Write an enzyme that holds these catalytic residues in place. Sequence first.
Site, mmCIF file in Angstrom:
data_model
loop_
_atom_site.group_PDB
_atom_site.id
_atom_site.type_symbol
_atom_site.label_atom_id
_atom_site.label_comp_id
_atom_site.label_asym_id
_atom_site.label_seq_id
_atom_site.Cartn_x
_atom_site.Cartn_y
_atom_site.Cartn_z
ATOM 1 N N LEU G 38 0.837 -1.188 0.000
ATOM 2 C CA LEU G 38 0.000 0.000 0.000
ATOM 3 C C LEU G 38 0.875 1.243 0.000
ATOM 4 C CD1 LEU G 38 -3.140 -0.447 2.305
ATOM 5 C CD2 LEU G 38 -2.921 -0.684 -0.173
ATOM 6 N N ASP G 39 0.410 2.269 -0.704
ATOM 7 C CA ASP G 39 1.090 3.550 -0.731
ATOM 8 C C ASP G 39 0.765 4.324 0.548
ATOM 9 O OD1 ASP G 39 2.620 5.673 -1.610
ATOM 10 O OD2 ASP G 39 1.577 5.913 -3.524
ATOM 11 N N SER G 40 1.473 5.441 0.749
ATOM 12 C CA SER G 40 1.174 6.320 1.876
ATOM 13 C C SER G 40 -0.187 6.987 1.721
ATOM 14 C CB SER G 40 2.270 7.375 2.024
ATOM 15 O OG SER G 40 3.543 6.771 2.172
ATOM 16 N N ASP G 42 -2.648 5.465 0.076
ATOM 17 C CA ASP G 42 -3.646 4.398 0.099
ATOM 18 C C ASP G 42 -4.208 4.200 1.502
ATOM 19 O OD1 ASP G 42 -3.633 3.840 -2.600
ATOM 20 O OD2 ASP G 42 -2.095 2.284 -2.451
#
Lengths: 106, 110, 161, 19, 446, 49, 84, 150, 144, 133
Positions: G38-40, G42
């Site tokens: 997961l991205d920051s 997300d």
Amino acid sequence: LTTEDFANPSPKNWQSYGFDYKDQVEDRKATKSTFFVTVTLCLVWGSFYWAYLPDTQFRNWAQREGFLELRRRELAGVDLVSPNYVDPASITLPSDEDLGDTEIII
Amino acid sequence: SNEEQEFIKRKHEATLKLRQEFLKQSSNPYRHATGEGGTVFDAGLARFQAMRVSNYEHFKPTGKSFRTGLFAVVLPIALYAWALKAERDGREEKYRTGQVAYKDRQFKFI
Amino acid sequence: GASETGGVKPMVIAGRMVRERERLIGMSPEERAWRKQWLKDQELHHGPRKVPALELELNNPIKRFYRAPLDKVCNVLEPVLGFQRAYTVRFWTGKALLALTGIYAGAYYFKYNQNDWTRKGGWRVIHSRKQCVPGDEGYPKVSDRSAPSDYAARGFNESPL
Amino acid sequence: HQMIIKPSRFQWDKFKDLL
Amino acid sequence: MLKIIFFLLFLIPFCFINNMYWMVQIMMFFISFIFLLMNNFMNYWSEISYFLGCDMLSYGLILLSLWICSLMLLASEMINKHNNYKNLFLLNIIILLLLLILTFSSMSLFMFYLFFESSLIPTLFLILGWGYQPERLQAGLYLLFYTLLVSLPMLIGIFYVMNKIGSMNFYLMNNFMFNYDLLYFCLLCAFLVKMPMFLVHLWLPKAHVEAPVSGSMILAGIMLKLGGYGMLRVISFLQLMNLKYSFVWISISLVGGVLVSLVCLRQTDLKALIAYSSVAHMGIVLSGLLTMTYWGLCGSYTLMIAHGLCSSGLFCLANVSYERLGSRSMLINKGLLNFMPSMTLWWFLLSSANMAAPPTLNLLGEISLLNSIVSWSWISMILLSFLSFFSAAYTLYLYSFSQHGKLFSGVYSFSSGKIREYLLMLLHWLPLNLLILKSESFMLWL
Amino acid sequence: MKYLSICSISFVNLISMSLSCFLLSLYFLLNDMIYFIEWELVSLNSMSI
Amino acid sequence: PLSLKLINERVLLVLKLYDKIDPSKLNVESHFINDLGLDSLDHVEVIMAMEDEFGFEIPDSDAEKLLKPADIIKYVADKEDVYE
Amino acid sequence: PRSPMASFAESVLNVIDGPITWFRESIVEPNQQKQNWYHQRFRRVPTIDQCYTDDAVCRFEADQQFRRDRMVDNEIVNILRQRFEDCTLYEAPDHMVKCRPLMDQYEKATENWFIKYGDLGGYANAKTAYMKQKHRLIWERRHGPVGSGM
Amino acid sequence: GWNKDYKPGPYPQTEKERLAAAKKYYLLPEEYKPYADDGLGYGDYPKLGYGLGVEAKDSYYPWDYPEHKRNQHEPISADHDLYSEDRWSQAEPPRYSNAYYFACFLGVMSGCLALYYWLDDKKMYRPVAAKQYPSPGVKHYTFE
Amino acid sequence: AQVPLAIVSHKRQVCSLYKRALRNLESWYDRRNVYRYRAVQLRARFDENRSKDLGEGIRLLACGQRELFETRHFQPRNFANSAGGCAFEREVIPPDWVLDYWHPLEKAQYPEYFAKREQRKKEFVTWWEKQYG
């Protein structure tokens, strides 16, 4: 403390009124007497006395005398309200030489 | 800046110590069980109280204070008194001269 | 001795967990158990019991003296309609009697002892002229009062003086 | 039925009945 | 009269008997009931006994004095719970009430002055004896030195009036008229300090705060009205000179009412905000007194009567939060609707009485006072609207911030409300709505 | 107020007062009639609050 | 009236309706960064998804202090005051 | 009786009027004793001009009759205003024409009240109105009527 | 434990007095900032945040006192009344300046008053004459 | 009991800007499909821009803060039950020690509850002696 202690409260665990915090006898006597000398004397019996107070000021007499005077003044027809305090012929005004430089105020 | 994070961390440690003091003193069962009402002893509340009461000890008659006391209090008082005196004198000379009729004067109290 | 608190020591119990923001920053599991025990303690199974000492102390003898016959009326209708449907017809009987008593007293006061010319403090009633349409008695109609003394007399025209 | 945390109203009701 | 004076003189030995604190207020309410009975008074002096007589202004002021002192013994149960000196407190209250009755039923100016400046010594004793602050010395010295400094040359003015006229009686001195500046300043400035001005007020917010509850009742209830009674007795023979110099005092009082009403929005004490609230209403009283109309004098008497009850009732309300929350600070006093909900009825009923309220005598005093001041000049409509708007801008702030909102965290357990306190704030508000009925009594003293 | 709803008490009281005021308002439209009662409080300078 | 099982069902339903999260890898103890990709931004989308689902507002410190779905369950159950 | 609303109002008025008339004529009118109360009449004490400056007996009596005459004249103006109010209510559409003599009489009453008691202040003695009358008559003698004076 | 004990003192001319006053008010030395040396200005009391009111402060922070938004032993600002949550505070900073709001309001007001009072004597009217009322001196006619 | 720390990272700053930008976008666009389309557009705008350096990221973060301040809605949508909402803290619960100041006849209406409270008082005083004593 258990359930039966709260279901039947002890008579020695008494909540005081605002008057005394030492014994229950002085609370009830002072509470009933202070409610006697303020409510049923100074607010109810005193207000009943002030309701049926007589004409200390003459406001009722002023209204009755005003009704009778307005009955009698318009019958004569001179004035409903008199503008003059005394009769203009009875008052002796000073002459213009008598006054000189006096401050006449109007 | 690295100096900012150390200052914030020291302030957070001091805030944590004061918070632990507040959680110790606010839920005190003995102080609640004494029955006498009161508050937890806060220093800043007493500082605010003595700040609001005592203020003459830091007062000096400077030009800024004189300007504030002149333009805040004395000047509206002087302007209002001058306006009231001017209006009452202007009405009083008309009343004393006789330029107004008897039945055409305001506020007869009738 | 006078105990304002009923003889038990007053203290807080639920602690710091009563605030929503202090609940979310972190909980030790003893505080979770304490909050769960407090929420199970705050529930009540049955309602409050009818303590007769509260009804005795919270009612003066004058209140019982003027509420006794309507209480007898509610008690004689108690097994007929139940408690809820008899207290309603008891409460709307005395209140209707009070409303009719106030209506009769106000009617008697405003039409038999209104303000006259001998008293200032009464209620001085002034009425306007009723509208006369055809089909009423005397449709050609002018103002009956025309004299200045007839206006706002307050019973001065029937004075014995 | 959760129990609401209300302050004591006995003294006000006793004051009303005494009045 | 002599019945009330000898009643208090024989009520003096009640103090020396132990466990006799509550009988004295019973007999005080009984003599207030007797004084309610003796009400055959008209605008002139009646019940003339030696040097003591009474007219309608004096009747209302003695009745207010008796009611305030009778409630003053009811409010101070903290003196009775502790072993603080009850006998000395009762003796000081009886002596002070006797001096107030003697200075209001005075037929002459000099006996009025003598008992008027005798009254400040029991107020001094209550402030320095029964207060709860380290600055009681700053409280009593400001009061005594302000009133004494401006009231000593009033004695020179009083004997100058005696040497020019001959008599001391109010009626014979009503006939004469003086055209001197310094006589006017002497006979006015002592009352101009005794009721609050803007410039001379200082003794008031620094003597109400540091006093007891009983000092607050006796100061904001009847000793802001000694100056009003004195000006109502003095202005009758100084009409020409006060018509020359009254615009200064009326302008100062109106701007000071607006400014002190702006002060109370920046006040963090309950007892200080009512102390400044006494300045704003008595500013309207002072502004309506100097216009010399019938309506100004009648509305001034009505507003002093209706203010001595409501300010004292507000000062009882700040005491019952100071006894429990431990401080008079406005930040601490927050959310008392959830602590004492039954008290909040009396808070709003006595805070609404401080402003214009529908059934109170304060509105009938404020209506008859704004009539005279708008009649005095049209420029006063700008600043009477600002003052009467700011009055409820600040007076709603004390009820709103003390009786609404979130609760102050970290407050310890205190006792609940009591029947004595509910009775104490009952008798500060039901006179305010039972006296609009028979209001020709408490308004037409002329 | 005990064993009953204060809202129900106020509801029945204000329907009764509203019906009485409505039936009074219909009688005052048939006659175009205005009443004005006056209770004196204090009189001074021929002006009556 | 809620329950821990119901709130757990809420959290796994919202996290399994996310197309960037595989439901086979999804678990109550699964970490949002190390275990799942997961991205920051997300995790912010997950936080506002829980805000729109549960009907309150989660602050930023409480947004960054949540790293597991069980942490979200413990945070929701503490706010809405249910433990059974 | 010509309308359902009029018949309903007549029925409500009869139900209202019945028991109160029964209570008056049956209970209140019997057992009431007959007594006489009288309107107080005051003799005219001589005024503030027919007495000396050193006497304070005359000043009290003339001040009291000045206060009594003030209250009577206030009631004259009040009754003359209430006459105009009753004219406005009784002649509701046509108040413009009929109330004009009453309004003129009331305005003359206000003018004469402001002649006698006007601008005296809260402390209006009997001598203050007399000195105001003296200065008013002097100003009428030397400057004509007030309103066109010099 | 009274007002004479805890009170603001003399102004910190030297740095050691500033450090002692910072430690007295439970504030870190860097945070502490006294007032000016003018006549109105306070001595030795800290100058707290005058930027924006209590609503600007974080309501999600766990406070010791949730009311007033402050912790224990934290120095209360001197103008705490003016910068309170009740009066003259905003949760977010305003979008525009203070003069733009009043400028737009009095601009719209001046335009509306001007355009109304210019058109006060251009009211329209139906093709209708004056309303004829009967008089005993002046008579009117019909068209039939 | 983790009290939050006042230092905010740059990634935390841009995450807060992303959250506030999507909240403002939800306030501006009421329909859910249009808000979803614009949210994916804003997410692509952020995702084309995350590969830059730190100083350029700080300057463009300040530019994004200025832009979000410029486009802020006059009536932003907020949850009602949370802080700052339309109906936040409508009722205030007093602390439970006022329950200890009831009358004993008033305490007799809930005797099991008051007995459980008196039982819990000893547990609380031992817990307080364990914790802070």
